[PDB]
Design a protein around this ligand. Structure first.
Ligand SMILES: Cc1cccc(I)c1
Ligand SMILES: [Cl-]
Length: 162
């Protein structure tokens, strides 16, 4: 297991524009295109991202390329964020994958309310952090995926993905 395999499990792979769990146009391995309700707006974002006129469809290679860019962007966003970087750097590699997973799903803004969870994670109070992480819209709206991520933070193992 690694972050790519983890997120590939959580996000799936679809080569045509689809709607994510929130109803937003997405493609590939969970690549958000737009929050606009306009399919044309999503198609424009797709063409811009791939560099050709795709009319809503990409290849597996293209999906994997976008996915690598998106994982890297999540990592570099963590490293540039004064709140997230100290916690991230305190974690082991398996738990760092759980952190990337959350940033990939929700962005830096979506994790802004996790201040108390971040403190518990930095303190290595794993069961306490796991309880706190579940008290969230995130957990309630995507409970099976949140449970896997939370188990990863709780245990520092890949058990939830095996
Ligand atoms: C709980 C959490 C989420 C995103 C990033 C980090 I570091 C920690
Ligand atoms: Cl879920």
């Amino acid at each position: 297991m690694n972050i790519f395999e983890m997120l590939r499990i959580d996000e799936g792979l679809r080569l045509k524009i689809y709607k994510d769990t929130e109803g937003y146009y997405t493609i590939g391995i969970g690549h958000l295109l737009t929050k606009s309700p306009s399919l044309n707006a999503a198609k424009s974002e797709l063409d811009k991202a791939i560099g050709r006129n795709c009319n809503g469809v990409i290849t597996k290679d293209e999906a994997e390329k976008l996915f690598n860019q998106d994982v890297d962007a999540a990592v570099r966003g963590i490293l540039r964020n004064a709140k997230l970087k100290p916690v991230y750097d305190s974690l082991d590699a398996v738990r760092r994958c759980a952190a990337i997973n959350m940033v990939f799903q929700m962005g830096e803004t979506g994790v802004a309310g996790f201040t108390n969870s971040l403190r518990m994670l930095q303190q290595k109070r794993w069961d306490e952090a796991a309880v706190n992480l579940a008290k969230s819209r995130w957990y309630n709206q995507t409970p099976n995926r949140a449970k896997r991520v939370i188990t990863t933070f709780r245990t520092g193992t890949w058990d939830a993905y095996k």
